[PDB]
C-alpha cells in the first residue's frame, strides 16, 4: 500500500516501536533515579563532603532538564517524515 | 478488477490490515502505559527524586500528545491514495 | 460476453468478492474493537495514567472516523469502472 | 465528431477530469486545514510565542484568500477554449 | 486539454501541491516555534544573559515578520502564470 | 510549474528550510549563551581579573549586537529573489 | 471437500481439538489454583511475612487477570482463518 518506500502498515509499526521504546526508557530511568535518590545522602551545608558532591547533583539536574526538548524534537521529526511521504505520493501518483 | 495496479479487493485488504494494526498498537500502548503509571510513584514536591524524575514524565506527556496528529495525517494519506487511483482510472479508461 | 476485457460475469464476480471482503472487514474490526473497549479502563480524570493514555484513544477515534469516506470513495470507484466499460463498448461496437 | 482536434466527447471527458480533480483538491485541502486548525494553539496576546507565530498564520490566510481568483480564471479559460474551437469549425467547414 | 504546455488538469494539480506544501510549512514552523518559545527563558532586564541573548530573538522576530510579504508575492505569481497561459491560448487559437 | 528554473513548490520548500534553520540557530545560540552567562563570574571592579576579562565580554556584546542587521538583510534577499523570478516570468511568457 | 488446503472436516476436527484443549487447561488451572489458595495463609497485616509474601500474590492476580484477553484474541483468530479460506475458495473457483 504505497508507491516506492512509503508503506502505511510500516509507518504504523514504526510508531508502535518508537512508542514502546520511549515508554521503556522512561520507566527504566525513573526506577533507576529513585535508587539514586535513595543512595546519596545530605552530609551538611558547608563541610568537605558537600563541596565534593554538590556539583555532581547539579550536573544531573541540568542534563535531565535538557531531556524534555530532546523528546519534543524527536516527536516533531515524525510529522516531517509523514509530510514528506504525502508529498512524494502526490508528486507522481498523478 | 482494475487497470494496472489499482485493485479494489487489494485496497479493502489494505484497509483491513492498517485498521487491525492501529487497533493493536492502541491496545498494547494503553496496557503498557497502565503499568508505567503503576510503577512510578510521587516522592515529594521539592526533594531530590522530584528533580531527578519530573522532566522524564514531562517528555512522556509531550510525545504522547504528539501522537494524535500523526494518526490524523496517517489517516488522510489514504484519501489521497484512493483519489490518485480514481484519477488514474479516468485518464486512460476513455 | 464482451469485446476485449469487459465481461459481465467477471464484473458480477468482482462485485461478489468486494462485497464479501468488506463484510468480513467490518465484522473483524467490530469484534476486535469490542475487545479493545473491554480491555482499556478509565483510571481518573487528571492522574498520570490519564495523561499517558488519553491521546491514544483520541487517535483511534480520529482514524475510525476517517474510515467512512474511504468506504464511500471505494464504492464510487465501481460506477466509474462500469461507465468506462459501457463507453468502451459503444465506441467500437458500431 | 470534429474536424482536426476539436472532439466533443474529448471536451466532455476533459470537463469530467477537471471537475473531479478540483473537487478532490477542495476536499483534501479542507480536511488538512482542519488538522492545521486543531494543531496550532493560541499562546497569549503579547508573549514570545505570539511574536514567533502570528505572521505565519497571516501568510496562510493571505494565500488561501488568493485561491478564489485563481479558480475563477481557471474556470474562464474553458470558455475561451470552446469559443476557439467553435470559430475553428466555422472558418473551414464552409 | 490545451495547446502546447498549458494543461488545466496540470494547473489544478500544481495548485493542489503548492497549497498542501504551504500548509505543511505553516504547521511545522508553528509547532517548532512553540518549542523555541518554551525553551528560551527570560533571565533579567540588564544582566549578562540579557545582553547575550536579546538580539537573537530580535532577529527571529524580524525574519518572521518578513515572511508574510514573501507569501503574498508567492501567491500573486500564480495569477501572472494563469494570465500568460490565457494570452498564449488566445494568440494562436484563432 | 514554471518556465526555466522558477518553481513555486521549490520556493516554498526553500522558505521552509531557511525558516527551520534560522529557528535552530536561534535556539542553539540562546541555550549556549545561557551556559556562557552561567560560567563567567564577576571578580571585582578594578582587580587584575577584571582587566583581563572585561574586553572579551565587550566583544561578545558587540558581535551579538551586529547579528540583527545580518538577519534583516538575509530576510530582504528573498524578496529580491522572488521579484526577479516574477520579472523573468513576465518577460518571455508573452 | 476443498481446493488446496481448506478442508471442512479438517476445520471441524481442529475446532474439536482446540475446544477440548482449552477446557482441559481451564480445569487443570482451576483445580491447581484451589490447592494454591489452600496452601498459602495470611500471617498478619504488617509483620515480616506479609512484606515477604504480598507482592507474589499480587503478581499472580495480575497475570491471571491478563488471561481473558489472551483467550479472546485466540478465539478471534479462527474467524480470520475461516474468512481467509472462504476468500481463497471464491478467488479461483470461478
XYZ file of C-alpha atoms in Angstrom:
658
model
C 0.000 0.000 0.000
C 2.316 2.689 -1.314
C 4.480 3.663 -4.262
C 8.215 3.178 -3.554
C 9.072 3.100 0.154
C 6.090 4.695 1.879
C 4.022 1.927 3.487
C 1.211 2.807 5.886
C 1.475 -0.522 7.781
C 5.225 0.039 8.073
C 4.662 3.556 9.409
C 2.180 2.255 11.979
C 4.632 -0.443 13.076
C 7.375 2.179 13.383
C 5.146 4.327 15.591
C 4.424 1.256 17.719
C 8.139 0.551 18.116
C 9.129 4.115 18.975
C 6.288 4.493 21.468
C 7.118 1.302 23.332
C 10.841 2.126 23.339
C 10.238 5.594 24.774
C 7.914 4.159 27.417
C 10.566 1.627 28.418
C 13.171 4.389 28.589
C 11.010 6.497 30.878
C 10.231 3.533 33.121
C 13.844 2.401 33.473
C 15.214 5.898 34.050
C 12.571 6.682 36.672
C 13.155 3.425 38.551
C 16.920 3.904 38.475
C 16.733 7.566 39.513
C 14.669 6.511 42.520
C 17.591 4.313 43.593
C 19.994 7.210 43.023
C 17.863 9.475 45.205
C 17.835 6.786 47.890
C 21.589 6.175 47.823
C 23.003 9.702 48.078
C 22.569 11.453 51.430
C 22.923 15.073 52.547
C 26.055 15.425 54.720
C 25.938 19.095 55.760
C 25.726 22.594 54.217
C 29.388 23.554 54.302
C 31.535 20.556 55.198
C 34.012 18.785 52.931
C 31.544 16.235 51.558
C 29.151 18.960 50.415
C 31.925 20.653 48.444
C 32.897 17.284 46.981
C 29.377 16.231 45.971
C 27.148 19.232 45.162
C 28.253 19.926 41.543
C 27.600 16.304 40.556
C 23.934 16.516 41.510
C 23.813 19.923 39.823
C 25.012 18.349 36.576
C 22.497 15.525 36.932
C 19.729 18.102 37.280
C 20.966 20.064 34.264
C 21.106 17.078 31.907
C 17.737 15.725 32.983
C 16.270 19.190 32.469
C 17.731 19.056 28.963
C 15.865 15.811 28.195
C 12.345 17.259 27.506
C 13.297 19.349 24.473
C 15.143 16.344 23.062
C 11.901 14.394 23.332
C 9.928 17.226 21.715
C 12.262 17.370 18.708
C 12.233 13.586 18.428
C 8.447 13.753 18.284
C 8.261 16.541 15.710
C 10.568 14.559 13.407
C 7.745 12.126 12.624
C 5.391 14.809 11.322
C 8.124 15.866 8.898
C 8.594 12.269 7.761
C 4.871 11.730 7.161
C 4.560 15.052 5.324
C 7.458 14.125 3.055
C 5.744 10.826 2.332
C 2.478 12.561 1.447
C 4.236 14.957 -0.923
C 6.110 12.065 -2.526
C 2.788 10.319 -3.136
C 1.213 13.422 -4.656
C 4.109 14.277 -6.979
C 3.971 11.160 -9.169
C 0.638 9.499 -8.455
C -0.842 11.964 -10.961
C -10.790 -5.510 -11.142
C -8.605 -2.604 -12.191
C -6.254 -1.389 -14.898
C -2.579 -1.557 -13.822
C -2.091 -1.626 -10.047
C -5.360 -0.332 -8.616
C -7.322 -3.300 -7.250
C -10.424 -2.715 -5.138
C -10.053 -6.043 -3.258
C -6.416 -5.159 -2.584
C -7.421 -1.730 -1.279
C -10.019 -3.291 1.016
C -7.457 -5.783 2.329
C -5.003 -2.936 2.934
C -7.624 -1.033 4.928
C -8.276 -4.195 6.944
C -4.570 -4.577 7.705
C -3.993 -0.956 8.693
C -7.090 -0.875 10.891
C -6.167 -4.014 12.799
C -2.552 -2.866 13.187
C -3.601 0.508 14.588
C -6.040 -1.174 16.970
C -3.284 -3.480 18.208
C -0.966 -0.503 18.667
C -3.523 1.363 20.747
C -4.253 -1.698 22.872
C -0.606 -2.514 23.574
C 0.382 1.079 24.319
C -2.568 1.580 26.670
C -1.885 -1.648 28.567
C 1.812 -0.838 28.874
C 1.196 2.774 29.923
C -1.053 1.486 32.697
C 1.932 -0.465 34.038
C 4.111 2.642 33.740
C 1.580 4.670 35.718
C 1.526 1.940 38.360
C 5.308 1.663 38.666
C 6.369 5.296 39.095
C 5.449 6.940 42.402
C 5.366 10.556 43.584
C 8.223 11.142 46.063
C 7.676 14.769 47.121
C 7.306 18.263 45.598
C 10.841 19.540 46.060
C 13.148 16.726 47.138
C 15.986 15.222 45.115
C 13.905 12.491 43.477
C 11.403 15.015 42.125
C 14.196 16.981 40.458
C 15.606 13.738 39.069
C 12.312 12.398 37.700
C 9.915 15.206 36.700
C 11.307 16.060 33.217
C 11.081 12.414 32.136
C 7.334 12.285 32.718
C 7.078 15.698 31.060
C 8.728 14.295 27.935
C 6.453 11.255 28.010
C 3.445 13.572 28.102
C 4.795 15.690 25.244
C 5.435 12.772 22.885
C 2.110 11.108 23.604
C 0.397 14.439 22.978
C 2.205 14.499 19.635
C 0.722 11.117 18.653
C -2.827 12.262 17.628
C -1.770 14.483 14.726
C 0.469 11.678 13.479
C -2.597 9.446 13.403
C -4.645 12.122 11.624
C -2.046 12.527 8.867
C -1.709 8.760 8.550
C -5.462 8.596 8.028
C -5.640 11.403 5.475
C -2.948 9.675 3.396
C -5.451 7.018 2.311
C -7.894 9.507 0.804
C -5.040 10.844 -1.323
C -4.139 7.324 -2.441
C -7.721 6.471 -3.417
C -8.144 9.785 -5.245
C -4.965 9.159 -7.219
C -6.296 5.735 -8.142
C -9.600 7.193 -9.335
C -7.837 9.777 -11.493
C -5.562 7.091 -12.927
C -8.637 5.071 -13.884
C -10.325 8.051 -15.526
C -7.301 9.199 -17.538
C -6.941 6.123 -19.760
C -10.168 4.162 -19.400
C -11.606 6.533 -22.019
C -19.876 -11.737 -23.358
C -17.866 -8.631 -24.156
C -15.377 -7.165 -26.601
C -11.826 -7.029 -25.163
C -11.710 -7.124 -21.359
C -15.207 -6.149 -20.251
C -17.022 -9.303 -19.118
C -20.359 -9.031 -17.322
C -19.880 -12.348 -15.446
C -16.421 -11.160 -14.402
C -17.852 -7.857 -13.172
C -20.516 -9.682 -11.164
C -17.884 -11.963 -9.624
C -15.767 -8.923 -8.749
C -18.732 -7.295 -7.011
C -19.296 -10.538 -5.101
C -15.664 -10.607 -3.974
C -15.514 -6.967 -2.899
C -18.808 -7.199 -1.023
C -17.803 -10.280 0.938
C -14.361 -8.825 1.699
C -15.841 -5.583 3.018
C -18.343 -7.516 5.128
C -15.529 -9.593 6.614
C -13.544 -6.433 7.332
C -16.451 -4.837 9.162
C -17.112 -7.989 11.174
C -13.493 -8.494 12.232
C -12.909 -4.842 13.105
C -16.110 -4.646 15.153
C -15.333 -7.836 17.078
C -11.772 -6.709 17.763
C -12.810 -3.186 18.778
C -15.199 -4.717 21.300
C -12.199 -6.423 22.916
C -10.287 -3.131 22.867
C -13.173 -1.369 24.600
C -13.245 -4.142 27.198
C -9.502 -4.090 27.879
C -8.818 -0.387 28.447
C -10.204 1.109 31.660
C -10.727 4.681 32.862
C -8.194 5.471 35.621
C -9.165 9.015 36.653
C -9.693 12.491 35.133
C -6.350 14.065 35.960
C -3.918 11.446 37.238
C -0.770 10.234 35.496
C -2.427 7.361 33.631
C -4.998 9.680 32.059
C -2.240 11.914 30.700
C -0.416 8.834 29.429
C -3.424 7.234 27.723
C -5.952 9.838 26.514
C -4.303 10.876 23.196
C -4.093 7.244 22.063
C -7.853 6.775 22.265
C -8.248 10.183 20.622
C -6.177 8.988 17.665
C -8.168 5.759 17.483
C -11.365 7.800 17.295
C -9.933 10.080 14.607
C -8.804 7.274 12.297
C -12.022 5.311 12.663
C -13.955 8.490 11.899
C -11.836 8.769 8.755
C -12.907 5.288 7.597
C -16.425 6.136 6.232
C -15.288 8.494 3.472
C -12.695 5.920 2.429
C -15.527 3.429 2.025
C -17.619 5.947 0.074
C -14.806 6.629 -2.403
C -14.104 2.913 -2.721
C -17.756 2.429 -3.619
C -17.931 5.256 -6.150
C -14.902 3.809 -7.964
C -17.038 0.963 -9.320
C -19.532 3.255 -11.041
C -16.612 4.877 -12.858
C -15.294 1.470 -13.913
C -18.671 0.323 -15.252
C -19.205 3.621 -17.081
C -15.802 3.313 -18.732
C -16.724 -0.197 -19.816
C -20.011 0.986 -21.321
C -18.280 3.754 -23.267
C -15.643 1.305 -24.491
C -18.416 -0.959 -25.771
C -20.191 1.890 -27.545
C -17.098 3.337 -29.233
C -16.246 0.346 -31.436
C -19.304 -1.898 -31.420
C -20.681 0.385 -34.148
C -17.042 14.180 -34.392
C -14.911 17.155 -35.355
C -12.509 18.453 -37.976
C -8.868 18.388 -36.778
C -8.505 18.314 -32.990
C -11.857 19.503 -31.664
C -13.774 16.471 -30.377
C -16.961 16.953 -28.367
C -16.554 13.628 -26.490
C -12.969 14.616 -25.691
C -14.119 18.007 -24.406
C -16.745 16.358 -22.206
C -14.155 13.936 -20.818
C -11.809 16.851 -20.119
C -14.550 18.665 -18.207
C -15.175 15.476 -16.227
C -11.487 15.199 -15.343
C -11.051 18.831 -14.322
C -14.220 18.808 -12.229
C -13.269 15.688 -10.304
C -9.704 16.941 -9.790
C -10.900 20.275 -8.411
C -13.365 18.509 -6.119
C -10.585 16.280 -4.799
C -8.374 19.321 -4.251
C -11.053 21.101 -2.250
C -11.762 18.008 -0.163
C -8.118 17.297 0.658
C -7.263 20.914 1.450
C -10.303 21.314 3.702
C -9.588 18.099 5.608
C -5.929 19.016 6.042
C -6.687 22.602 7.085
C -8.989 21.235 9.777
C -5.993 19.365 11.209
C -3.898 22.537 10.997
C -6.553 24.479 12.897
C -6.614 21.735 15.525
C -2.838 21.569 15.956
C -1.901 25.230 16.435
C -2.979 26.828 19.716
C -3.209 30.434 20.910
C -0.456 31.092 23.486
C -1.146 34.695 24.540
C -1.569 38.185 23.020
C 1.909 39.564 23.605
C 4.261 36.814 24.749
C 7.209 35.405 22.816
C 5.266 32.622 21.098
C 2.737 35.077 19.673
C 5.524 37.134 18.109
C 7.075 33.942 16.755
C 3.871 32.511 15.270
C 1.425 35.252 14.202
C 2.907 36.166 10.771
C 2.827 32.520 9.668
C -0.932 32.277 10.123
C -1.235 35.689 8.472
C 0.560 34.352 5.398
C -1.625 31.246 5.384
C -4.701 33.472 5.386
C -3.321 35.643 2.583
C -2.516 32.758 0.235
C -5.812 30.993 0.835
C -7.601 34.275 0.165
C -5.685 34.405 -3.114
C -7.033 30.986 -4.160
C -10.578 32.030 -5.299
C -9.492 34.297 -8.154
C -7.130 31.566 -9.337
C -10.124 29.244 -9.524
C -12.190 31.868 -11.361
C -9.514 32.364 -14.026
C -9.054 28.611 -14.348
C -12.780 28.338 -14.997
C -12.957 31.152 -17.542
C -10.147 29.515 -19.537
C -12.532 26.790 -20.716
C -14.996 29.214 -22.294
C -12.114 30.646 -24.318
C -11.072 27.160 -25.420
C -14.592 26.206 -26.519
C -15.052 29.516 -28.346
C -11.791 28.994 -30.215
C -12.988 25.537 -31.196
C -16.293 26.902 -32.493
C -14.536 29.549 -34.581
C -12.136 26.939 -35.949
C -15.116 24.834 -37.016
C -16.835 27.771 -38.701
C -13.782 29.018 -40.606
C -13.257 25.966 -42.828
C -16.433 23.908 -42.584
C -17.853 26.249 -45.240
C -6.815 19.951 -22.867
C -4.538 22.714 -24.092
C -2.307 23.768 -26.961
C 1.416 23.390 -26.130
C 2.151 23.319 -22.395
C -0.934 24.815 -20.765
C -2.971 21.979 -19.239
C -5.886 22.763 -16.932
C -5.586 19.433 -15.043
C -1.866 20.104 -14.622
C -2.578 23.597 -13.292
C -5.105 22.209 -10.812
C -2.612 19.579 -9.644
C 0.040 22.279 -9.235
C -2.325 24.349 -7.094
C -3.026 21.247 -5.003
C 0.694 20.651 -4.485
C 1.548 24.239 -3.578
C -1.385 24.519 -1.181
C -0.523 21.345 0.697
C 3.171 22.279 0.832
C 2.418 25.720 2.261
C 0.050 24.203 4.819
C 2.741 21.746 5.897
C 5.256 24.584 6.168
C 2.958 26.614 8.392
C 2.193 23.617 10.595
C 5.825 22.591 11.063
C 7.070 26.124 11.700
C 4.318 26.816 14.236
C 4.935 23.568 16.119
C 8.686 24.159 16.172
C 8.354 27.809 17.219
C 6.224 26.677 20.150
C 9.172 24.562 21.312
C 11.506 27.531 20.835
C 9.236 29.721 22.954
C 9.198 27.019 25.625
C 12.970 26.520 25.682
C 14.269 30.087 25.999
C 13.670 31.806 29.341
C 13.879 35.429 30.486
C 16.925 35.863 32.764
C 16.664 39.523 33.815
C 16.399 43.023 32.280
C 20.026 44.091 32.492
C 22.231 41.152 33.447
C 24.834 39.467 31.257
C 22.491 36.853 29.791
C 20.057 39.511 28.580
C 22.844 41.296 26.710
C 23.964 37.965 25.267
C 20.513 36.812 24.134
C 18.223 39.750 23.264
C 19.427 40.495 19.686
C 18.916 36.861 18.663
C 15.215 36.959 19.494
C 15.050 40.369 17.818
C 16.402 38.848 14.606
C 13.962 35.949 14.866
C 11.108 38.441 15.132
C 12.387 40.454 12.167
C 12.694 37.486 9.804
C 9.333 36.028 10.760
C 7.781 39.450 10.211
C 9.362 39.378 6.756
C 7.620 36.083 5.912
C 4.084 37.429 5.111
C 5.073 39.562 2.121
C 7.055 36.620 0.760
C 3.865 34.573 0.913
C 1.863 37.354 -0.757
C 4.291 37.583 -3.684
C 4.385 33.801 -3.981
C 0.602 33.856 -4.252
C 0.419 36.650 -6.818
C 2.860 34.749 -9.052
C 0.138 32.238 -9.939
C -2.250 34.857 -11.308
C 0.530 36.007 -13.634
C 1.145 32.431 -14.770
C -2.538 31.785 -15.497
C -2.887 35.106 -17.330
C 0.112 34.276 -19.504
C -1.477 30.931 -20.298
C -4.763 32.574 -21.285
C -2.999 35.033 -23.585
C -0.986 32.206 -25.136
C -4.232 30.365 -25.864
C -5.848 33.428 -27.424
C -2.903 34.380 -29.645
C -2.874 31.272 -31.852
C -6.179 29.508 -31.256
C -7.647 31.941 -33.801
C 5.004 24.893 -12.526
C 7.381 27.430 -14.021
C 9.396 28.253 -17.117
C 13.136 27.551 -16.652
C 14.233 27.450 -13.009
C 11.472 29.231 -11.108
C 9.356 26.603 -9.335
C 6.769 27.667 -6.765
C 6.962 24.341 -4.855
C 10.751 24.681 -4.818
C 10.486 28.235 -3.487
C 8.109 27.103 -0.744
C 10.466 24.272 0.218
C 13.373 26.727 0.313
C 11.426 29.021 2.640
C 10.668 26.013 4.846
C 14.355 25.092 5.004
C 15.608 28.597 5.755
C 12.967 29.162 8.426
C 13.730 25.941 10.267
C 17.488 26.542 10.018
C 17.187 30.050 11.451
C 14.964 28.775 14.258
C 17.524 26.098 15.109
C 20.292 28.701 15.077
C 18.417 30.950 17.480
C 17.616 28.054 19.803
C 21.173 26.712 19.927
C 22.782 30.126 20.373
C 20.370 31.085 23.155
C 20.886 27.812 25.028
C 24.660 28.066 24.697
C 24.757 31.740 25.704
C 22.841 30.832 28.853
C 25.694 28.472 29.755
C 28.220 31.216 28.994
C 26.376 33.620 31.288
C 26.369 30.957 33.998
C 30.068 30.124 33.690
C 31.701 33.563 33.810
C 31.596 35.360 37.164
C 32.237 38.961 38.215
C 35.522 39.142 40.171
C 35.691 42.821 41.175
C 35.582 46.315 39.611
C 39.292 47.057 39.442
C 41.314 43.942 40.227
C 43.526 42.011 37.821
C 40.826 39.602 36.643
C 38.526 42.456 35.631
C 41.257 43.967 33.461
C 41.929 40.535 31.975
C 38.294 39.685 31.212
C 36.196 42.808 30.519
C 37.095 43.409 26.827
C 36.166 39.825 25.927
C 32.590 40.261 27.119
C 32.558 43.657 25.406
C 33.442 41.990 22.104
C 30.794 39.324 22.658
C 28.213 42.063 23.160
C 29.358 43.926 20.046
C 29.165 40.920 17.719
C 25.801 39.778 19.031
C 24.509 43.320 18.576
C 25.723 43.074 14.982
C 23.621 39.940 14.376
C 20.155 41.589 13.906
C 21.023 43.597 10.794
C 22.591 40.477 9.297
C 19.264 38.725 9.803
C 17.358 41.658 8.289
C 19.490 41.641 5.132
C 19.220 37.863 4.897
C 15.449 38.254 5.002
C 15.256 41.028 2.416
C 17.283 38.896 -0.014
C 14.275 36.630 -0.580
C 12.002 39.439 -1.753
C 14.624 40.314 -4.364
C 14.805 36.686 -5.490
C 11.025 36.365 -5.836
C 10.787 39.687 -7.685
C 13.467 38.572 -10.131
C 11.519 35.375 -10.701
C 8.308 37.296 -11.388
C 10.041 39.565 -13.896
C 11.631 36.555 -15.587
C 8.179 35.006 -15.956
C 6.691 38.186 -17.403
C 9.470 38.849 -19.922
C 9.003 35.731 -22.064
C 5.633 34.275 -21.111
C 4.136 36.806 -23.541
C -14.014 -31.280 0.118
C -11.941 -28.239 -0.762
C -9.493 -26.858 -3.296
C -5.893 -26.821 -1.979
C -5.652 -26.904 1.819
C -9.080 -25.821 3.039
C -10.949 -28.914 4.248
C -14.214 -28.536 6.154
C -13.771 -31.857 8.030
C -10.245 -30.769 8.951
C -11.535 -27.419 10.212
C -14.183 -29.156 12.317
C -11.570 -31.507 13.779
C -9.335 -28.529 14.568
C -12.190 -26.805 16.396
C -12.786 -30.022 18.340
C -9.122 -30.195 19.345
C -8.827 -26.557 20.396
C -12.062 -26.683 22.382
C -11.084 -29.783 24.324
C -7.576 -28.429 24.962
C -8.915 -25.138 26.314
C -11.401 -26.987 28.516
C -8.602 -29.142 29.918
C -6.500 -26.039 30.552
C -9.295 -24.349 32.471
C -9.981 -27.472 34.520
C -6.346 -28.080 35.458
C -5.625 -24.444 36.293
C -8.748 -24.144 38.445
C -8.002 -27.347 40.360
C -4.388 -26.324 40.919
C -5.286 -22.767 41.951
C -7.633 -24.215 44.560
C -4.633 -26.003 46.083
C -2.627 -22.771 45.953
C -5.399 -20.916 47.773
C -5.466 -23.674 50.386
C -1.702 -23.732 50.941
C -0.890 -20.048 51.466
C -2.122 -18.498 54.717
C -2.498 -14.907 55.917
C 0.149 -14.181 58.586
C -0.682 -10.605 59.631
C -1.157 -7.122 58.112
C 2.258 -5.645 58.818
C 4.652 -8.330 60.028
C 7.702 -9.642 58.187
C 5.899 -12.473 56.394
C 3.347 -10.085 54.897
C 6.123 -7.939 53.435
C 7.811 -11.078 52.119
C 4.701 -12.594 50.524
C 2.212 -9.921 49.386
C 3.779 -8.947 46.010
C 3.842 -12.588 44.889
C 0.079 -12.944 45.219
C -0.269 -9.533 43.573
C 1.665 -10.801 40.554
C -0.426 -13.971 40.455
C -3.565 -11.836 40.364
C -2.157 -9.610 37.618
C -1.191 -12.459 35.285
C -4.452 -14.323 35.769
C -6.314 -11.091 35.054
C -4.295 -10.888 31.840
C -5.507 -14.340 30.736
C -9.042 -13.394 29.484
C -7.929 -11.083 26.676
C -5.450 -13.737 25.561
C -8.366 -16.145 25.264
C -10.447 -13.573 23.371
C -7.700 -12.986 20.798
C -7.120 -16.722 20.476
C -10.813 -17.101 19.703
C -10.988 -14.281 17.165
C -8.067 -15.825 15.258
C -10.330 -18.612 13.988
C -12.812 -16.254 12.340
C -9.908 -14.727 10.418
C -8.727 -18.176 9.337
C -12.180 -19.227 8.118
C -12.677 -15.922 6.291
C -9.342 -16.339 4.528
C -10.404 -19.825 3.494
C -13.703 -18.550 2.093
C -11.957 -15.843 0.076
C -9.436 -18.374 -1.222
C -12.316 -20.561 -2.397
C -14.065 -17.667 -4.126
C -10.989 -16.320 -5.923
C -10.301 -19.345 -8.139
C -13.422 -21.496 -8.009
C -14.822 -19.185 -10.701
